[PDB]
């Protein structure tokens, strides 16, 4: 198994919460293959550096409203390691699917 914070399995999906503060914490997350996922970004840092979230392997690039939650939804059908980052590719995270 891979190191990192595992998503919680429940009600036909899996969910993990990521705090946006000077980057992402946790910045290492672990998801189950083939299970619809909710990656909930709670934005607490108003830096323009963190205005967007990007999952390049999944085609996601979206605005994160300050002081609010925003949910990235993906269903990872392939095992492996996938990156995520801010819209500037300056702040980073890693998602392992297994
Ligand atoms: Cl910046
Ligand atoms: Cu950034
Ligand atoms: Cu930046």
PDB file of N, CA and C and ligand atoms in Angstrom:
ATOM      1  N   UNK A   1       0.808  -1.206   0.000  1.00  0.00           N
ATOM      2  CA  UNK A   1       0.000   0.000   0.000  1.00  0.00           C
ATOM      3  C   UNK A   1       0.844   1.259   0.000  1.00  0.00           C
ATOM      4  N   UNK A   2       0.245   2.367  -0.422  1.00  0.00           N
ATOM      5  CA  UNK A   2       0.953   3.638  -0.497  1.00  0.00           C
ATOM      6  C   UNK A   2       0.767   4.475   0.765  1.00  0.00           C
ATOM      7  N   UNK A   3       1.775   5.281   1.080  1.00  0.00           N
ATOM      8  CA  UNK A   3       1.700   6.217   2.193  1.00  0.00           C
ATOM      9  C   UNK A   3       0.778   7.374   1.824  1.00  0.00           C
ATOM     10  N   UNK A   4       0.173   7.999   2.830  1.00  0.00           N
ATOM     11  CA  UNK A   4      -0.676   9.155   2.601  1.00  0.00           C
ATOM     12  C   UNK A   4      -2.052   9.000   3.216  1.00  0.00           C
ATOM     13  N   UNK A   5      -2.838  10.070   3.196  1.00  0.00           N
ATOM     14  CA  UNK A   5      -4.164  10.037   3.797  1.00  0.00           C
ATOM     15  C   UNK A   5      -5.169   9.337   2.893  1.00  0.00           C
ATOM     16  N   UNK A   6      -5.747   8.248   3.389  1.00  0.00           N
ATOM     17  CA  UNK A   6      -6.767   7.521   2.645  1.00  0.00           C
ATOM     18  C   UNK A   6      -8.113   8.236   2.675  1.00  0.00           C
ATOM     19  N   UNK A   7      -8.812   8.192   1.549  1.00  0.00           N
ATOM     20  CA  UNK A   7     -10.176   8.688   1.487  1.00  0.00           C
ATOM     21  C   UNK A   7     -11.066   7.815   2.358  1.00  0.00           C
ATOM     22  N   UNK A   8     -12.187   8.377   2.793  1.00  0.00           N
ATOM     23  CA  UNK A   8     -13.187   7.625   3.536  1.00  0.00           C
ATOM     24  C   UNK A   8     -14.185   7.022   2.555  1.00  0.00           C
ATOM     25  N   UNK A   9     -14.405   5.716   2.655  1.00  0.00           N
ATOM     26  CA  UNK A   9     -15.380   5.033   1.812  1.00  0.00           C
ATOM     27  C   UNK A   9     -16.773   5.121   2.425  1.00  0.00           C
ATOM     28  N   UNK A  10     -17.753   5.570   1.643  1.00  0.00           N
ATOM     29  CA  UNK A  10     -19.134   5.635   2.127  1.00  0.00           C
ATOM     30  C   UNK A  10     -20.172   5.962   1.052  1.00  0.00           C
ATOM     31  N   UNK A  11     -21.330   5.317   1.167  1.00  0.00           N
ATOM     32  CA  UNK A  11     -22.484   5.554   0.295  1.00  0.00           C
ATOM     33  C   UNK A  11     -22.204   5.604  -1.207  1.00  0.00           C
ATOM     34  N   UNK A  12     -21.396   4.664  -1.685  1.00  0.00           N
ATOM     35  CA  UNK A  12     -21.130   4.533  -3.109  1.00  0.00           C
ATOM     36  C   UNK A  12     -20.096   5.507  -3.641  1.00  0.00           C
ATOM     37  N   UNK A  13     -19.408   6.191  -2.736  1.00  0.00           N
ATOM     38  CA  UNK A  13     -18.318   7.074  -3.127  1.00  0.00           C
ATOM     39  C   UNK A  13     -17.204   7.049  -2.092  1.00  0.00           C
ATOM     40  N   UNK A  14     -16.166   7.836  -2.338  1.00  0.00           N
ATOM     41  CA  UNK A  14     -15.092   8.015  -1.373  1.00  0.00           C
ATOM     42  C   UNK A  14     -14.802   9.499  -1.272  1.00  0.00           C
ATOM     43  N   UNK A  15     -14.436   9.951  -0.081  1.00  0.00           N
ATOM     44  CA  UNK A  15     -14.285  11.374   0.165  1.00  0.00           C
ATOM     45  C   UNK A  15     -13.031  11.669   0.965  1.00  0.00           C
ATOM     46  N   UNK A  16     -12.348  12.737   0.587  1.00  0.00           N
ATOM     47  CA  UNK A  16     -11.224  13.214   1.367  1.00  0.00           C
ATOM     48  C   UNK A  16     -11.251  14.730   1.385  1.00  0.00           C
ATOM     49  N   UNK A  17     -10.888  15.300   2.527  1.00  0.00           N
ATOM     50  CA  UNK A  17     -10.898  16.741   2.705  1.00  0.00           C
ATOM     51  C   UNK A  17      -9.479  17.284   2.657  1.00  0.00           C
ATOM     52  N   UNK A  18      -9.291  18.339   1.873  1.00  0.00           N
ATOM     53  CA  UNK A  18      -7.985  18.967   1.733  1.00  0.00           C
ATOM     54  C   UNK A  18      -8.089  20.434   2.112  1.00  0.00           C
ATOM     55  N   UNK A  19      -7.287  20.853   3.084  1.00  0.00           N
ATOM     56  CA  UNK A  19      -7.241  22.249   3.486  1.00  0.00           C
ATOM     57  C   UNK A  19      -6.278  23.005   2.588  1.00  0.00           C
ATOM     58  N   UNK A  20      -6.736  24.133   2.055  1.00  0.00           N
ATOM     59  CA  UNK A  20      -5.886  24.982   1.235  1.00  0.00           C
ATOM     60  C   UNK A  20      -5.322  26.086   2.114  1.00  0.00           C
ATOM     61  N   UNK A  21      -4.070  25.905   2.514  1.00  0.00           N
ATOM     62  CA  UNK A  21      -3.381  26.844   3.378  1.00  0.00           C
ATOM     63  C   UNK A  21      -1.892  26.715   3.107  1.00  0.00           C
ATOM     64  N   UNK A  22      -1.320  27.720   2.449  1.00  0.00           N
ATOM     65  CA  UNK A  22       0.087  27.693   2.087  1.00  0.00           C
ATOM     66  C   UNK A  22       0.415  26.428   1.320  1.00  0.00           C
ATOM     67  N   UNK A  23      -0.503  26.035   0.448  1.00  0.00           N
ATOM     68  CA  UNK A  23      -0.420  24.755  -0.220  1.00  0.00           C
ATOM     69  C   UNK A  23      -1.603  23.902   0.187  1.00  0.00           C
ATOM     70  N   UNK A  24      -1.414  22.590   0.181  1.00  0.00           N
ATOM     71  CA  UNK A  24      -2.501  21.662   0.450  1.00  0.00           C
ATOM     72  C   UNK A  24      -2.102  20.731   1.573  1.00  0.00           C
ATOM     73  N   UNK A  25      -2.997  20.528   2.531  1.00  0.00           N
ATOM     74  CA  UNK A  25      -2.754  19.531   3.562  1.00  0.00           C
ATOM     75  C   UNK A  25      -4.039  18.754   3.834  1.00  0.00           C
ATOM     76  N   UNK A  26      -3.969  17.420   3.741  1.00  0.00           N
ATOM     77  CA  UNK A  26      -2.774  16.662   3.350  1.00  0.00           C
ATOM     78  C   UNK A  26      -2.444  16.825   1.862  1.00  0.00           C
ATOM     79  N   UNK A  27      -1.158  16.755   1.522  1.00  0.00           N
ATOM     80  CA  UNK A  27      -0.717  16.891   0.132  1.00  0.00           C
ATOM     81  C   UNK A  27      -0.390  15.529  -0.473  1.00  0.00           C
ATOM     82  N   UNK A  28      -0.626  14.480   0.309  1.00  0.00           N
ATOM     83  CA  UNK A  28      -0.518  13.107  -0.161  1.00  0.00           C
ATOM     84  C   UNK A  28      -1.834  12.427   0.168  1.00  0.00           C
ATOM     85  N   UNK A  29      -2.555  12.004  -0.860  1.00  0.00           N
ATOM     86  CA  UNK A  29      -3.843  11.356  -0.657  1.00  0.00           C
ATOM     87  C   UNK A  29      -3.923  10.032  -1.401  1.00  0.00           C
ATOM     88  N   UNK A  30      -4.694   9.101  -0.851  1.00  0.00           N
ATOM     89  CA  UNK A  30      -4.767   7.751  -1.390  1.00  0.00           C
ATOM     90  C   UNK A  30      -6.217   7.352  -1.628  1.00  0.00           C
ATOM     91  N   UNK A  31      -6.535   7.046  -2.883  1.00  0.00           N
ATOM     92  CA  UNK A  31      -7.893   6.698  -3.279  1.00  0.00           C
ATOM     93  C   UNK A  31      -7.988   5.271  -3.800  1.00  0.00           C
ATOM     94  N   UNK A  32      -9.185   4.698  -3.703  1.00  0.00           N
ATOM     95  CA  UNK A  32      -9.454   3.375  -4.247  1.00  0.00           C
ATOM     96  C   UNK A  32      -9.829   3.461  -5.723  1.00  0.00           C
ATOM     97  N   UNK A  33      -9.231   2.587  -6.524  1.00  0.00           N
ATOM     98  CA  UNK A  33      -9.540   2.517  -7.942  1.00  0.00           C
ATOM     99  C   UNK A  33     -11.029   2.254  -8.179  1.00  0.00           C
ATOM    100  N   UNK A  34     -11.600   2.972  -9.145  1.00  0.00           N
ATOM    101  CA  UNK A  34     -12.955   2.711  -9.646  1.00  0.00           C
ATOM    102  C   UNK A  34     -14.100   3.208  -8.761  1.00  0.00           C
ATOM    103  N   UNK A  35     -13.773   3.876  -7.663  1.00  0.00           N
ATOM    104  CA  UNK A  35     -14.800   4.410  -6.775  1.00  0.00           C
ATOM    105  C   UNK A  35     -14.932   5.917  -6.972  1.00  0.00           C
ATOM    106  N   UNK A  36     -16.148   6.393  -7.282  1.00  0.00           N
ATOM    107  CA  UNK A  36     -16.353   7.834  -7.475  1.00  0.00           C
ATOM    108  C   UNK A  36     -15.821   8.623  -6.285  1.00  0.00           C
ATOM    109  N   UNK A  37     -15.077   9.690  -6.551  1.00  0.00           N
ATOM    110  CA  UNK A  37     -14.391  10.419  -5.491  1.00  0.00           C
ATOM    111  C   UNK A  37     -14.852  11.862  -5.352  1.00  0.00           C
ATOM    112  N   UNK A  38     -14.882  12.316  -4.103  1.00  0.00           N
ATOM    113  CA  UNK A  38     -15.100  13.709  -3.752  1.00  0.00           C
ATOM    114  C   UNK A  38     -13.849  14.193  -3.040  1.00  0.00           C
ATOM    115  N   UNK A  39     -13.140  15.128  -3.659  1.00  0.00           N
ATOM    116  CA  UNK A  39     -11.981  15.736  -3.032  1.00  0.00           C
ATOM    117  C   UNK A  39     -12.390  17.154  -2.668  1.00  0.00           C
ATOM    118  N   UNK A  40     -12.611  17.372  -1.378  1.00  0.00           N
ATOM    119  CA  UNK A  40     -13.224  18.598  -0.900  1.00  0.00           C
ATOM    120  C   UNK A  40     -12.159  19.597  -0.478  1.00  0.00           C
ATOM    121  N   UNK A  41     -11.994  20.649  -1.272  1.00  0.00           N
ATOM    122  CA  UNK A  41     -11.013  21.682  -0.974  1.00  0.00           C
ATOM    123  C   UNK A  41     -11.637  22.795  -0.156  1.00  0.00           C
ATOM    124  N   UNK A  42     -11.117  22.990   1.049  1.00  0.00           N
ATOM    125  CA  UNK A  42     -11.595  24.048   1.923  1.00  0.00           C
ATOM    126  C   UNK A  42     -10.560  25.159   1.905  1.00  0.00           C
ATOM    127  N   UNK A  43     -10.889  26.276   1.262  1.00  0.00           N
ATOM    128  CA  UNK A  43      -9.896  27.321   1.043  1.00  0.00           C
ATOM    129  C   UNK A  43      -9.837  28.328   2.183  1.00  0.00           C
ATOM    130  N   UNK A  44      -8.664  28.428   2.804  1.00  0.00           N
ATOM    131  CA  UNK A  44      -8.469  29.302   3.952  1.00  0.00           C
ATOM    132  C   UNK A  44      -7.344  30.311   3.727  1.00  0.00           C
ATOM    133  N   UNK A  45      -6.720  30.248   2.555  1.00  0.00           N
ATOM    134  CA  UNK A  45      -5.594  31.115   2.220  1.00  0.00           C
ATOM    135  C   UNK A  45      -5.962  31.966   1.004  1.00  0.00           C
ATOM    136  N   UNK A  46      -6.009  33.297   1.176  1.00  0.00           N
ATOM    137  CA  UNK A  46      -6.492  34.191   0.116  1.00  0.00           C
ATOM    138  C   UNK A  46      -5.443  34.531  -0.945  1.00  0.00           C
ATOM    139  N   UNK A  47      -4.246  33.964  -0.840  1.00  0.00           N
ATOM    140  CA  UNK A  47      -3.208  34.249  -1.823  1.00  0.00           C
ATOM    141  C   UNK A  47      -3.684  33.937  -3.233  1.00  0.00           C
ATOM    142  N   UNK A  48      -3.483  34.880  -4.165  1.00  0.00           N
ATOM    143  CA  UNK A  48      -3.827  34.623  -5.568  1.00  0.00           C
ATOM    144  C   UNK A  48      -3.124  33.384  -6.122  1.00  0.00           C
ATOM    145  N   UNK A  49      -2.005  32.998  -5.520  1.00  0.00           N
ATOM    146  CA  UNK A  49      -1.306  31.787  -5.936  1.00  0.00           C
ATOM    147  C   UNK A  49      -2.227  30.565  -5.862  1.00  0.00           C
ATOM    148  N   UNK A  50      -3.217  30.620  -4.976  1.00  0.00           N
ATOM    149  CA  UNK A  50      -4.081  29.469  -4.711  1.00  0.00           C
ATOM    150  C   UNK A  50      -5.501  29.618  -5.272  1.00  0.00           C
ATOM    151  N   UNK A  51      -5.662  30.496  -6.259  1.00  0.00           N
ATOM    152  CA  UNK A  51      -6.975  30.779  -6.840  1.00  0.00           C
ATOM    153  C   UNK A  51      -7.594  29.601  -7.588  1.00  0.00           C
ATOM    154  N   UNK A  52      -6.754  28.729  -8.136  1.00  0.00           N
ATOM    155  CA  UNK A  52      -7.251  27.606  -8.921  1.00  0.00           C
ATOM    156  C   UNK A  52      -6.672  26.275  -8.470  1.00  0.00           C
ATOM    157  N   UNK A  53      -7.420  25.208  -8.734  1.00  0.00           N
ATOM    158  CA  UNK A  53      -6.959  23.848  -8.494  1.00  0.00           C
ATOM    159  C   UNK A  53      -6.941  23.105  -9.826  1.00  0.00           C
ATOM    160  N   UNK A  54      -5.890  22.322 -10.047  1.00  0.00           N
ATOM    161  CA  UNK A  54      -5.699  21.614 -11.309  1.00  0.00           C
ATOM    162  C   UNK A  54      -5.358  20.142 -11.078  1.00  0.00           C
ATOM    163  N   UNK A  55      -6.121  19.253 -11.715  1.00  0.00           N
ATOM    164  CA  UNK A  55      -5.793  17.832 -11.797  1.00  0.00           C
ATOM    165  C   UNK A  55      -5.594  17.536 -13.280  1.00  0.00           C
ATOM    166  N   UNK A  56      -4.349  17.652 -13.767  1.00  0.00           N
ATOM    167  CA  UNK A  56      -4.096  17.599 -15.212  1.00  0.00           C
ATOM    168  C   UNK A  56      -4.446  16.259 -15.861  1.00  0.00           C
ATOM    169  N   UNK A  57      -4.356  15.164 -15.114  1.00  0.00           N
ATOM    170  CA  UNK A  57      -4.672  13.851 -15.672  1.00  0.00           C
ATOM    171  C   UNK A  57      -6.164  13.647 -15.879  1.00  0.00           C
ATOM    172  N   UNK A  58      -6.969  14.436 -15.177  1.00  0.00           N
ATOM    173  CA  UNK A  58      -8.414  14.252 -15.190  1.00  0.00           C
ATOM    174  C   UNK A  58      -9.160  15.385 -15.892  1.00  0.00           C
ATOM    175  N   UNK A  59      -8.421  16.374 -16.387  1.00  0.00           N
ATOM    176  CA  UNK A  59      -9.013  17.472 -17.133  1.00  0.00           C
ATOM    177  C   UNK A  59      -9.656  18.553 -16.282  1.00  0.00           C
ATOM    178  N   UNK A  60      -9.370  18.543 -14.985  1.00  0.00           N
ATOM    179  CA  UNK A  60      -9.952  19.520 -14.073  1.00  0.00           C
ATOM    180  C   UNK A  60      -9.053  20.737 -13.875  1.00  0.00           C
ATOM    181  N   UNK A  61      -9.627  21.921 -14.053  1.00  0.00           N
ATOM    182  CA  UNK A  61      -8.973  23.164 -13.661  1.00  0.00           C
ATOM    183  C   UNK A  61     -10.054  24.171 -13.295  1.00  0.00           C
ATOM    184  N   UNK A  62     -10.201  24.416 -11.996  1.00  0.00           N
ATOM    185  CA  UNK A  62     -11.344  25.163 -11.487  1.00  0.00           C
ATOM    186  C   UNK A  62     -10.959  26.198 -10.440  1.00  0.00           C
ATOM    187  N   UNK A  63     -11.787  27.228 -10.317  1.00  0.00           N
ATOM    188  CA  UNK A  63     -11.593  28.258  -9.311  1.00  0.00           C
ATOM    189  C   UNK A  63     -11.995  27.783  -7.920  1.00  0.00           C
ATOM    190  N   UNK A  64     -11.177  28.121  -6.928  1.00  0.00           N
ATOM    191  CA  UNK A  64     -11.499  27.846  -5.534  1.00  0.00           C
ATOM    192  C   UNK A  64     -11.895  29.143  -4.849  1.00  0.00           C
ATOM    193  N   UNK A  65     -13.171  29.272  -4.461  1.00  0.00           N
ATOM    194  CA  UNK A  65     -13.590  30.505  -3.783  1.00  0.00           C
ATOM    195  C   UNK A  65     -12.993  30.600  -2.380  1.00  0.00           C
ATOM    196  N   UNK A  66     -12.470  31.771  -2.033  1.00  0.00           N
ATOM    197  CA  UNK A  66     -11.903  31.989  -0.707  1.00  0.00           C
ATOM    198  C   UNK A  66     -12.946  31.788   0.392  1.00  0.00           C
ATOM    199  N   UNK A  67     -12.547  31.098   1.455  1.00  0.00           N
ATOM    200  CA  UNK A  67     -13.402  30.911   2.613  1.00  0.00           C
ATOM    201  C   UNK A  67     -14.537  29.936   2.386  1.00  0.00           C
ATOM    202  N   UNK A  68     -14.463  29.187   1.292  1.00  0.00           N
ATOM    203  CA  UNK A  68     -15.516  28.234   0.961  1.00  0.00           C
ATOM    204  C   UNK A  68     -14.970  26.867   0.571  1.00  0.00           C
ATOM    205  N   UNK A  69     -15.867  25.888   0.525  1.00  0.00           N
ATOM    206  CA  UNK A  69     -15.529  24.554   0.060  1.00  0.00           C
ATOM    207  C   UNK A  69     -15.795  24.450  -1.431  1.00  0.00           C
ATOM    208  N   UNK A  70     -14.933  23.721  -2.123  1.00  0.00           N
ATOM    209  CA  UNK A  70     -15.182  23.380  -3.511  1.00  0.00           C
ATOM    210  C   UNK A  70     -14.811  21.926  -3.725  1.00  0.00           C
ATOM    211  N   UNK A  71     -15.702  21.171  -4.356  1.00  0.00           N
ATOM    212  CA  UNK A  71     -15.493  19.738  -4.519  1.00  0.00           C
ATOM    213  C   UNK A  71     -15.040  19.363  -5.920  1.00  0.00           C
ATOM    214  N   UNK A  72     -13.865  18.749  -5.997  1.00  0.00           N
ATOM    215  CA  UNK A  72     -13.405  18.135  -7.229  1.00  0.00           C
ATOM    216  C   UNK A  72     -13.941  16.711  -7.274  1.00  0.00           C
ATOM    217  N   UNK A  73     -14.676  16.389  -8.330  1.00  0.00           N
ATOM    218  CA  UNK A  73     -15.208  15.044  -8.490  1.00  0.00           C
ATOM    219  C   UNK A  73     -14.528  14.332  -9.647  1.00  0.00           C
ATOM    220  N   UNK A  74     -13.946  13.176  -9.348  1.00  0.00           N
ATOM    221  CA  UNK A  74     -13.323  12.332 -10.357  1.00  0.00           C
ATOM    222  C   UNK A  74     -13.622  10.878 -10.023  1.00  0.00           C
ATOM    223  N   UNK A  75     -13.550  10.010 -11.024  1.00  0.00           N
ATOM    224  CA  UNK A  75     -13.650   8.574 -10.788  1.00  0.00           C
ATOM    225  C   UNK A  75     -12.425   7.906 -11.398  1.00  0.00           C
ATOM    226  N   UNK A  76     -11.397   7.665 -10.574  1.00  0.00           N
ATOM    227  CA  UNK A  76     -10.122   7.155 -11.089  1.00  0.00           C
ATOM    228  C   UNK A  76     -10.186   5.668 -11.426  1.00  0.00           C
ATOM    229  N   UNK A  77     -10.188   5.350 -12.716  1.00  0.00           N
ATOM    230  CA  UNK A  77     -10.315   3.964 -13.162  1.00  0.00           C
ATOM    231  C   UNK A  77      -8.968   3.290 -13.370  1.00  0.00           C
ATOM    232  N   UNK A  78      -7.895   4.043 -13.164  1.00  0.00           N
ATOM    233  CA  UNK A  78      -6.554   3.528 -13.370  1.00  0.00           C
ATOM    234  C   UNK A  78      -5.700   3.725 -12.120  1.00  0.00           C
ATOM    235  N   UNK A  79      -5.041   2.661 -11.673  1.00  0.00           N
ATOM    236  CA  UNK A  79      -4.092   2.766 -10.573  1.00  0.00           C
ATOM    237  C   UNK A  79      -2.887   3.592 -11.008  1.00  0.00           C
ATOM    238  N   UNK A  80      -2.233   4.237 -10.049  1.00  0.00           N
ATOM    239  CA  UNK A  80      -1.029   4.991 -10.341  1.00  0.00           C
ATOM    240  C   UNK A  80      -0.878   6.225  -9.477  1.00  0.00           C
ATOM    241  N   UNK A  81       0.067   7.080  -9.854  1.00  0.00           N
ATOM    242  CA  UNK A  81       0.327   8.321  -9.137  1.00  0.00           C
ATOM    243  C   UNK A  81      -0.051   9.496 -10.028  1.00  0.00           C
ATOM    244  N   UNK A  82      -0.854  10.406  -9.490  1.00  0.00           N
ATOM    245  CA  UNK A  82      -1.362  11.531 -10.262  1.00  0.00           C
ATOM    246  C   UNK A  82      -1.149  12.823  -9.503  1.00  0.00           C
ATOM    247  N   UNK A  83      -0.740  13.858 -10.220  1.00  0.00           N
ATOM    248  CA  UNK A  83      -0.412  15.120  -9.584  1.00  0.00           C
ATOM    249  C   UNK A  83      -1.640  16.006  -9.461  1.00  0.00           C
ATOM    250  N   UNK A  84      -1.616  16.891  -8.476  1.00  0.00           N
ATOM    251  CA  UNK A  84      -2.489  18.049  -8.509  1.00  0.00           C
ATOM    252  C   UNK A  84      -1.692  19.262  -8.077  1.00  0.00           C
ATOM    253  N   UNK A  85      -2.175  20.439  -8.443  1.00  0.00           N
ATOM    254  CA  UNK A  85      -1.424  21.657  -8.199  1.00  0.00           C
ATOM    255  C   UNK A  85      -2.324  22.866  -8.328  1.00  0.00           C
ATOM    256  N   UNK A  86      -1.812  24.019  -7.924  1.00  0.00           N
ATOM    257  CA  UNK A  86      -2.533  25.262  -8.131  1.00  0.00           C
ATOM    258  C   UNK A  86      -2.467  25.625  -9.608  1.00  0.00           C
ATOM    259  N   UNK A  87      -3.184  26.675  -9.988  1.00  0.00           N
ATOM    260  CA  UNK A  87      -3.219  27.106 -11.373  1.00  0.00           C
ATOM    261  C   UNK A  87      -1.889  27.601 -11.918  1.00  0.00           C
ATOM    262  N   UNK A  88      -0.922  27.835 -11.031  1.00  0.00           N
ATOM    263  CA  UNK A  88       0.405  28.311 -11.431  1.00  0.00           C
ATOM    264  C   UNK A  88       1.448  27.199 -11.449  1.00  0.00           C
ATOM    265  N   UNK A  89       1.050  26.000 -11.035  1.00  0.00           N
ATOM    266  CA  UNK A  89       1.982  24.881 -10.906  1.00  0.00           C
ATOM    267  C   UNK A  89       3.101  25.219  -9.919  1.00  0.00           C
ATOM    268  N   UNK A  90       2.752  25.950  -8.860  1.00  0.00           N
ATOM    269  CA  UNK A  90       3.712  26.331  -7.821  1.00  0.00           C
ATOM    270  C   UNK A  90       3.506  25.543  -6.532  1.00  0.00           C
ATOM    271  N   UNK A  91       2.245  25.276  -6.202  1.00  0.00           N
ATOM    272  CA  UNK A  91       1.891  24.492  -5.023  1.00  0.00           C
ATOM    273  C   UNK A  91       1.388  23.132  -5.483  1.00  0.00           C
ATOM    274  N   UNK A  92       1.803  22.068  -4.797  1.00  0.00           N
ATOM    275  CA  UNK A  92       1.616  20.715  -5.318  1.00  0.00           C
ATOM    276  C   UNK A  92       1.039  19.703  -4.338  1.00  0.00           C
ATOM    277  N   UNK A  93       0.415  18.677  -4.904  1.00  0.00           N
ATOM    278  CA  UNK A  93      -0.045  17.521  -4.161  1.00  0.00           C
ATOM    279  C   UNK A  93       0.104  16.276  -5.015  1.00  0.00           C
ATOM    280  N   UNK A  94       0.000  15.115  -4.380  1.00  0.00           N
ATOM    281  CA  UNK A  94       0.071  13.847  -5.090  1.00  0.00           C
ATOM    282  C   UNK A  94      -1.090  12.965  -4.675  1.00  0.00           C
ATOM    283  N   UNK A  95      -1.722  12.341  -5.659  1.00  0.00           N
ATOM    284  CA  UNK A  95      -2.820  11.431  -5.404  1.00  0.00           C
ATOM    285  C   UNK A  95      -2.445  10.043  -5.899  1.00  0.00           C
ATOM    286  N   UNK A  96      -2.447   9.072  -4.996  1.00  0.00           N
ATOM    287  CA  UNK A  96      -2.197   7.694  -5.379  1.00  0.00           C
ATOM    288  C   UNK A  96      -3.521   6.955  -5.470  1.00  0.00           C
ATOM    289  N   UNK A  97      -3.719   6.239  -6.571  1.00  0.00           N
ATOM    290  CA  UNK A  97      -4.898   5.404  -6.744  1.00  0.00           C
ATOM    291  C   UNK A  97      -4.436   3.955  -6.721  1.00  0.00           C
ATOM    292  N   UNK A  98      -5.063   3.138  -5.882  1.00  0.00           N
ATOM    293  CA  UNK A  98      -4.641   1.751  -5.732  1.00  0.00           C
ATOM    294  C   UNK A  98      -5.826   0.805  -5.583  1.00  0.00           C
TER     295      UNK A  98
HETATM  296 CL1  LIG B   1       2.420  33.281  -6.799  1.00  0.00          CL
HETATM  297 CU1  LIG B   2      -0.009  28.757  -6.734  1.00  0.00          CU
HETATM  298 CU1  LIG B   3       1.897  31.131  -7.528  1.00  0.00          CU
END
